[PDB]
Amino acid sequence: YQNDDVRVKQIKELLPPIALLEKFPATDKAAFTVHEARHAIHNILVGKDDRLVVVIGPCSIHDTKAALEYAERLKEIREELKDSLEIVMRVYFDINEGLRIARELLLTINDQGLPTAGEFLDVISPQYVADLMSWGAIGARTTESQIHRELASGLSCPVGFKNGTDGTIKIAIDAINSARSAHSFLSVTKWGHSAIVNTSGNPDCHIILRGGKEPNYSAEHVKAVREGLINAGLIPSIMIDFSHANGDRSITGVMIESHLWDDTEKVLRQLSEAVIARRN
Amino acid sequence: YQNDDVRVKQIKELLPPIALLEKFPATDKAAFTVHEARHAIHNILVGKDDRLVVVIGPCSIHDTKAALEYAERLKEIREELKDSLEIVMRVYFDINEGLRIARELLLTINDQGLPTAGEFLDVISPQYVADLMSWGAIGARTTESQIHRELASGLSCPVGFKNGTDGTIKIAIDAINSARSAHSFLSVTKWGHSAIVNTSGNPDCHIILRGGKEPNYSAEHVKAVREGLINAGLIPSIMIDFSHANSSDVSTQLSQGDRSITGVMIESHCIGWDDTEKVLRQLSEAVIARRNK
Amino acid sequence: NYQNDDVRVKQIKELLPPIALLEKFPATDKAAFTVHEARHAIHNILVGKDDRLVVVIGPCSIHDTKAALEYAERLKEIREELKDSLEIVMRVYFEDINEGLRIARELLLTINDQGLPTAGEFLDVISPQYVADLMSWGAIGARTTESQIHRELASGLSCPVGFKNGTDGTIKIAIDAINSARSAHSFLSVTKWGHSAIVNTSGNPDCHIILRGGKEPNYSAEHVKAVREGLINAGLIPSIMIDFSHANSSKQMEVATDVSTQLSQGDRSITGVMIESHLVCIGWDDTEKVLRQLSEAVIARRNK
Amino acid sequence: YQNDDVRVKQIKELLPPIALLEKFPATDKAAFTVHEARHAIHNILVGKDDRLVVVIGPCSIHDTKAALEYAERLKEIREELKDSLEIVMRVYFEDINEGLRIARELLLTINDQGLPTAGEFLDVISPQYVADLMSWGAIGARTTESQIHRELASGLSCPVGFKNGTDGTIKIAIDAINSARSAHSFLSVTKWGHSAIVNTSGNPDCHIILRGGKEPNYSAEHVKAVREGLINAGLIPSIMIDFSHANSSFEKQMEVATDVSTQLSQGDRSITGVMIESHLVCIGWDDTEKVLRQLSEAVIARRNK
Numbered sequence A: 001y002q003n004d005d006v007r008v009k010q011i012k013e014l015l016p017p018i019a020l021l022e023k024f025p026a027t028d029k030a031a032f033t034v035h036e037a038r039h040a041i042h043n044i045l046v047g048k049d050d051r052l053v054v055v056i057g058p059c060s061i062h063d064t065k066a067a068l069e070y071a072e073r074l075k076e077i078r079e080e081l082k083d084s085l086e087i088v089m090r091v092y093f094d095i096n097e098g099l100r101i102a103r104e105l106l107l108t109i110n111d112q113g114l115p116t117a118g119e120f121l122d123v124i125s126p127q128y129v130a131d132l133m134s135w136g137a138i139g140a141r142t143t144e145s146q147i148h149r150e151l152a153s154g155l156s157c158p159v160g161f162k163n164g165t166d167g168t169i170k171i172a173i174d175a176i177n178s179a180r181s182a183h184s185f186l187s188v189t190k191w192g193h194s195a196i197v198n199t200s201g202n203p204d205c206h207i208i209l210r211g212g213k214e215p216n217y218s219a220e221h222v223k224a225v226r227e228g229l230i231n232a233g234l235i236p237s238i239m240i241d242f243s244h245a246n247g248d249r250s251i252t253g254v255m256i257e258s259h260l261w262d263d264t265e266k267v268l269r270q271l272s273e274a275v276i277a278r279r280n
Numbered sequence B: 001y002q003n004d005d006v007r008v009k010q011i012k013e014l015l016p017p018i019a020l021l022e023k024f025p026a027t028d029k030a031a032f033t034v035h036e037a038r039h040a041i042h043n044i045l046v047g048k049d050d051r052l053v054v055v056i057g058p059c060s061i062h063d064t065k066a067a068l069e070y071a072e073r074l075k076e077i078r079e080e081l082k083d084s085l086e087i088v089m090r091v092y093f094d095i096n097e098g099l100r101i102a103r104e105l106l107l108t109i110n111d112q113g114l115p116t117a118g119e120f121l122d123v124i125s126p127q128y129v130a131d132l133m134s135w136g137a138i139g140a141r142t143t144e145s146q147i148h149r150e151l152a153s154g155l156s157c158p159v160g161f162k163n164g165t166d167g168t169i170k171i172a173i174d175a176i177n178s179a180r181s182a183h184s185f186l187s188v189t190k191w192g193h194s195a196i197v198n199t200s201g202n203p204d205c206h207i208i209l210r211g212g213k214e215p216n217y218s219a220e221h222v223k224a225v226r227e228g229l230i231n232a233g234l235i236p237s238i239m240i241d242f243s244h245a246n247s248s249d250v251s252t253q254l255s256q257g258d259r260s261i262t263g264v265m266i267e268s269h270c271i272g273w274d275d276t277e278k279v280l281r282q283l284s285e286a287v288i289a290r291r292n293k
Numbered sequence C: 001n002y003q004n005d006d007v008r009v010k011q012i013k014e015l016l017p018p019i020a021l022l023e024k025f026p027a028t029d030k031a032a033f034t035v036h037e038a039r040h041a042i043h044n045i046l047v048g049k050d051d052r053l054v055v056v057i058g059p060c061s062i063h064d065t066k067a068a069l070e071y072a073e074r075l076k077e078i079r080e081e082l083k084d085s086l087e088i089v090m091r092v093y094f095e096d097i098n099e100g101l102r103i104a105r106e107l108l109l110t111i112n113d114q115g116l117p118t119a120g121e122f123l124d125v126i127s128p129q130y131v132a133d134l135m136s137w138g139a140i141g142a143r144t145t146e147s148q149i150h151r152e153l154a155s156g157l158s159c160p161v162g163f164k165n166g167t168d169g170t171i172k173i174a175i176d177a178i179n180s181a182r183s184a185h186s187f188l189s190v191t192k193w194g195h196s197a198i199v200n201t202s203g204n205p206d207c208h209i210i211l212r213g214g215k216e217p218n219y220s221a222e223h224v225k226a227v228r229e230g231l232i233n234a235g236l237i238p239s240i241m242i243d244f245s246h247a248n249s250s251k252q253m254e255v256a257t258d259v260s261t262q263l264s265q266g267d268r269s270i271t272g273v274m275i276e277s278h279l280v281c282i283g284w285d286d287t288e289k290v291l292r293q294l295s296e297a298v299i300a301r302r303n304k
Numbered sequence D: 001y002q003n004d005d006v007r008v009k010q011i012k013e014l015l016p017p018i019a020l021l022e023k024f025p026a027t028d029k030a031a032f033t034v035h036e037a038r039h040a041i042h043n044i045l046v047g048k049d050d051r052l053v054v055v056i057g058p059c060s061i062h063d064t065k066a067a068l069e070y071a072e073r074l075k076e077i078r079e080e081l082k083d084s085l086e087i088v089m090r091v092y093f094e095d096i097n098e099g100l101r102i103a104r105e106l107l108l109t110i111n112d113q114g115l116p117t118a119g120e121f122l123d124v125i126s127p128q129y130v131a132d133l134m135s136w137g138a139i140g141a142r143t144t145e146s147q148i149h150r151e152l153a154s155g156l157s158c159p160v161g162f163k164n165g166t167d168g169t170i171k172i173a174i175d176a177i178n179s180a181r182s183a184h185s186f187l188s189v190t191k192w193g194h195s196a197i198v199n200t201s202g203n204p205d206c207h208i209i210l211r212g213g214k215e216p217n218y219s220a221e222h223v224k225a226v227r228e229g230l231i232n233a234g235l236i237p238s239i240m241i242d243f244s245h246a247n248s249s250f251e252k253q254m255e256v257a258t259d260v261s262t263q264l265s266q267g268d269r270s271i272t273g274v275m276i277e278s279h280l281v282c283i284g285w286d287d288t289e290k291v292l293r294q295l296s297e298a299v300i301a302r303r304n305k
């Protein structure tokens, strides 16, 4: 009585994570870009830093050449606007060749001094690229999932919980809360072997406002959200996603979807000015 | 700079899945009980069998002995009401001793002729006991997750996608629509090794009514769900979870001839064992009644 | 094109991890204590603290486990009867590797759980991870005794080990083997989870020569006198094991008597013997006889 | 009752062989070098090529920069003496994870520079990390009688050399050559680092190395007695003389070269290969040029008698 893998057409072994960490080791320069950017994003998130975190980047990468050019352009503005903004590049995408292409781009961009951001879709793929990640988002459809909250509880970067696909703010405040506590999930070791991951908790989680039924970047949503975070005994630290379905010091970060460029300069220069205006 | 496992307190290697299947191989009775039960649930779901899948069991297992005595009791009712209710037991609970204790119980129960049911919450644990699984539920907090639908696409058992914690039914209709297609998710091999899982599609995916802001077992919800499934081009095979936010009707719906209700979910010894006999006997009578229309 | 890899490999198949073998066939408290007490007892005999002789006796090859488990029951009674004179351990040598490993463990678990200690041979660095927890003694054959890799396997083996003389009668390869094993080494093998690993060793002081014949036999009082002088000149404890079979015999029964006379004369250097015995290679009747004979030769040694 | 790992101080996981082939992927240049060399060595071992195989290299590699300079000089000699000699460099090493990285990066660079590499197979696991870069390999005198070794040779993608015993025993190698030609089985690790069963198809390209013993074994008389030894056994009389080790115990390895060069000139087609231990600063670089040029001239002379 064949009862196993009845609907599995194929199970091919995946290169162990250590094989991507050996083929593509973090340069000291990548390591510091990742390490400084995390601490930066932390200082901004708790209010220690008056600058704004800016996750901007292509909607999706289809060409690594095209992306390395965007990055070159972005790094200039990253440091040109360094005292008003914290610019991070958003890098969304054979799985083995895919994992190699993914890692090489994140390492090259962090070695060029540009910190990288993306989405933590599952609990196994972080073991391959999170050493080069300074920030990540949990999607609207996986915010209420418990494994995605446990995942963040052990992610080494700050984490953005998006709101519900209807516009629910409670699953995010409950997620942010959950991530702050130790947890246990199941994934693999850097050798690729089924393992138990015991977390210590991530205090650097915050909500993303990405829309829903109708947009929610309105001051009144942000006021309702900020009162929602305060009641739950959380730092009112808010990020607004300008894309997808979308002196106030409770807005600590924005999110932008930008391809190859003119309005990107305009928007970054515009938010720069509003950050400067807030210090007064 | 230390940028790795900064928020990891420990990463301990887990027994490979093959080591649970070696320590506890399926008997031919388990093997048979799993295969027959899964085929039965399919026929009941797609309207070839007029019986009703009853997923009943304790809300939580704290003792293995107590659960083995419940299984013995429920097996007797399963054999009696076999021409009205395909009865399946709900089995919800060191991870290695937890995997050992969970596998042994599911084998023992299937080797006793009682098919077992559970909840698939991750993409790794299935590899340890799915061979002993005849049905499974996908929770309300993981029904819009693409990973949990792609898991169901490659699950060898019939799958139940619960509604949302509010009452959303589309996540599940979309879930059922998704599972029916080939997908790909990352999991481990039976040797415990990171892998690419290419699926084929599970056509045996269905909706569960677990309640929400307000219970949804009423005939109209069932009619709505039927119409919502009908509009998505999906068979209106519906299951109502008498428990959860639907407890904090169905029988007469069936007595009157609702063929859409094809399954139920009960949380018993959470009722005690006497009401369990009553409710199974009640629904048995309702399925008998449904055939005379 | 230009296939440069696995050109002469017909198939590579993943073998169960050692953990799947120790999980399906876990040691029992009775099996654990038999291995522990035999390994301690074999050590005390090899060092002179025990006057008893080690007796590694068992079938030439195991094709049937019922036949092996019946020999196990018979041999156990003789182990219990001659316990004050002999340390009897069964030789479990067999000819799907995955099933062969399942069959081998279940056999060693059953025999050690019945209270009979098991002895075998180490031919590889990987197979020990599946069955050595049930091994109270083991051997390094004459064709692997000059191989450092095995000397490093013996350096990290939890059982006392026996190195065999050259297939030509060469003693140096094993006096050198014992010296190497006494040291900490490092050999590549797998974990209990089946993963390529580096094994760091502490050294095994419980390694000893097995006389098994090379060109002509080597069991006479003269070969032992000169093998013992060779261990003494090299600073090694003079503990010797004579295999009555293989080359020393072609008669196991004639070698038994020559060795029994040596023990009766007072040779405390012979601390162990090896016999190849089946039930239906001597038979059960001659096994009782050789065992009862060596027991009386140990009792005689005590008095001289 | 601690019955496990009582004599094990530490067991650490070694990198999967795949982490080494990913970080140090073979180049199309390394691949063609290994491929054409394994095939050139085979044609010389069976008489299809009148050239001689030369396994020459340092005794011990403690510096890659010193080896890479030796590789550069040697390659020019390989290209100059190509019509008379199949020159291959011997790469023998004295954190195993770092030593794996150093070993493979070196064998990759040298095969990428077009110089085929030659080493020794000590165990059944290490191969999986660098054998894709080996054009020849050896089994030493202390493991030639070992089944596990002859089963690994049965499934090696390169021609293999079995050394005689440390007493000078030829049979074990005639028995080693025989066994290796048969299909066998051994337990090793996959390219993913996992416990495995390796089924072999057998290796016809295996031969004897005369490395020494109680006294040397390179005289015309030993080769004659060794070649008759192989003939009886029904085996291609294809012999390899190791000038070093116990055949020369520098100044003697050069006497062994003249002794051997004289037998080849005579016409001994049964000598298909030599082994020389050479360093820069073990003979020096100047003697290496000389001995390669010597053996080249003897091979040239062999074609005329």
Ligand SMILES: O=C(O)[C@]1(O)C[C@@H](O)[C@@H](O)[C@H](O)C1
Residues within 6 Å of the ligand: A003, A004, A005, A006, A007, A008, A011, B123, B126, B127, B128, B129, B130, B131, B151, B154, B155, B156, B157, B187, B188, B197
């Ligand atoms: O490949 C997997 O991860 C599975 O989900 C688990 C396995 O045990 C089977 O029963 C499933 O059909 C597939």
Ligand SMILES: O=C(O)[C@]1(O)C[C@@H](O)[C@@H](O)[C@H](O)C1
Residues within 6 Å of the ligand: C004, C005, C006, C007, C008, C009, C012, D124, D127, D128, D131, D132, D152, D155, D156, D157, D158, D188, D189, D198
């Ligand atoms: O499978 C092995 O263990 C090998 O030894 C690995 C590598 O050396 C290949 O080239 C051999 O053909 C086989």
Ligand SMILES: O=C(O)[C@]1(O)C[C@@H](O)[C@@H](O)[C@H](O)C1
Residues within 6 Å of the ligand: C124, C125, C126, C127, C128, C129, C132, C133, C153, C156, C157, C158, C189, C190, C199, D004, D005, D006, D008
């Ligand atoms: O189990 C042991 O005692 C071992 O000695 C442990 C380790 O050394 C393994 O590699 C050996 O093969 C067996």
Ligand SMILES: O=C(O)[C@]1(O)C[C@@H](O)[C@H](O)[C@H](O)C1
Residues within 6 Å of the ligand: A123, A124, A126, A127, A128, A130, A131, A154, A155, A156, A157, A187, A197, B003, B004, B005, B006, B007, B008
């Ligand atoms: O277990 C994991 O998935 C991680 O690899 C652990 C975490 O601490 C890392 O730094 C990565 O952010 C994710």
